[PDB]
Every structure is written in C-alpha cells, then in structure tokens.
Amino acid sequence: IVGGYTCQENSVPYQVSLNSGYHFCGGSLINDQWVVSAAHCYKSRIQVRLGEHNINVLEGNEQFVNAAKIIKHPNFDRETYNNDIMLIKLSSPVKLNARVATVALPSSCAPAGTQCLISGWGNTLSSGVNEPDLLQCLDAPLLPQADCEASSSFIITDNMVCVGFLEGGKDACQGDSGGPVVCNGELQGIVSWGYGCALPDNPGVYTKVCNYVDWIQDTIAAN
Ligand SMILES: [Ca+2]
C-alpha cells in the first residue's frame, strides 16, 4: 500500500497473508475454512497466515494453516486478469476470535463514491520496492468506470472496478494482490492489477466481487 497508514493492531481481522516461504499475496477469510484471493496468486502449495500484524515477528495471535484446495476461477484470463478470483479451502477450520474474523460477501454492487478500506503488506513505494513489516491500511473511494479510463493507460472489463485517487500518491501495489477492499463491512473488491503504483491518472484495478457471489457459494457448497 503506497501512501497509507499502519493499521491498528488486528483491526482488519479478516486479512490473511499467503505465504510460500515468504509473503507473496493477501486474501480475505470469508468463513472458518475458506479464503478468497486473486487467481493470479495461485501456487501449488500455500500456507495461509491469520491473525497477523507484523509478518516478521511472532506476536502470539497467529494461526498458520495449510491450503487444502486451491481453486481458480475457471475463466481466469492471465492476459487481461479478467475473472481474477480464487478460493482456498483450508486444511482445517480456524479458531475465530477477536483477531481472526470473517468478512461478509456483498449483498449488492457498491455505488461509485462509496468509501472503502484496502489493506496489505505490499510495496509501499511508487518507485522502487519496500516491503513493510506491519499491515498497512488505505481509505479510498470506488470510482466511476468512466473517470478511471479518462486519462489512464488502460481499460477495464465489467468484472473490474477502479478504487483510488486520480491525482495519485495513494494506491495498492505489488504484494497487496489478492487482498481486500471492504466497504461498509462487505468485501467489494480484490486487489488485482494496475499501471505502476500510485501514479496520477492511473487508479488501481480490482476484481468486482459482487459479480461472483453465486460462483463463490456454489464452489464452497460443492467442495
Ligand atoms: Ca506475526
């Protein structure tokens, strides 16, 4: 997260870190045994870390659980990142508490202008790379489709939504991928891609979660 602030300890209880020897993506706990992330974060073996604040220091609230089933959306297109969503079934249910909690699936698609919270351990610089130890937070609004593409060097599909600032300075970045965009307590987006990080005229692009609620529930029921 570029231009954000350090989240209060365990204030984003649904936030998880996908680890394969190192943190490489984020995700959201949607129930005691399922995590939703981005399909581009797929790896054959993943350890999901919950209850984290400082990813490099053991604090006493962590739960590390291996992924049992890693399911990418069948129509994920790696070229365009269309349908960039993935579900992870944990090897065992986690212990839900104050520091490890679930986030609700959306009941409807949030309107442009809605204020949301984006979080992650991704890159904090608009140039170069710096991985933070502590979970970063960013309050940003959902932008209208038209305003996003106005002066950007990219276009998006109907399964994508732009969240951020057209003036730049604040944005998600590499390493935040798969992470949550929560608006009014519901998961409305998943960190997916963008041109650079925090650049003027180029807001971040996120998977529009409200378009997949049915797929999510069916998959969870069938596995
Ligand atoms: Ca820790």
- Residues 153 and 73 placed together within one structural domain of the fold: no
Binding site for Ca(2+): residue ranges?
A: 52, 54, 57, 62
Is 109 buried (19+), middle (13-18) or exposed (0-12) by CB count in 10 A? middle
| Percent of the chain as helix, strand, coil, to the nearest 5 | 10, 35, 55
- Residue pair 162/206 in contact (Cβ under 8 Å)? The answer is yes
- Residue pair 43/27 in contact (Cβ under 8 Å)? The answer is no
- Residues 200 and 216 placed together within one structural domain of the fold: no
Distance 194 CA to ligand 1 centre (A): 28
- Residue pair 86/13 in contact (Cβ under 8 Å)? The answer is no
Give one DSSP letter per residue of 131-158, joined into a string.
Answer: --SB-EEEEEEBPPHHHHHSS-S----T
Q: Which domain holds residue 157?
A: 1-12+103-210
Distance 55 CA to ligand 1 centre (A): 4
Provide the number of structural domains found in the chain: 2
- Residue pair 155/201 in contact (Cβ under 8 Å)? The answer is no
Task: Report, as residue numbers or ranges, the catalytic residues.
Answer: 40, 84, 177
Measured between alpha carbons, how far apart are the two ends of the chain, in Å? 33
- Residues 171 and 94 placed together within one structural domain of the fold: no
Q: How was this structure determined?
A: X-ray
- Residues 204 and 147 placed together within one structural domain of the fold: yes
Per-residue tokens: 52: 């984290």
Distance 202 CA to ligand 1 centre (A): 33
- Residues 119 and 98 placed together within one structural domain of the fold: no
Report residue 54: phi and psi, to 5°.
-95, 110
- Residues 91 and 198 placed together within one structural domain of the fold: no
- Residues 221 and 123 placed together within one structural domain of the fold: no
- Residues 30 and 113 placed together within one structural domain of the fold: no
Amino acid letter at 140? A
- CATH code for position 220: 2.40.10.10
- Strand extents, DSSP E, 73-218: 86-90, 115-120, 136-141, 160-163, 180-183, 186-193, 204-208
Whole-angstrom Cα Rg for the chain: 16
Resolution (A): 2.0
Binding site: residue ranges?
A: 52, 54, 57, 62
Give the span between the Cα atoms of 22 and 47, in whole angstroms. 10
- Residues 160 and 82 placed together within one structural domain of the fold: no
- Residues 50 and 124 placed together within one structural domain of the fold: no
- Residues 119 and 176 placed together within one structural domain of the fold: yes
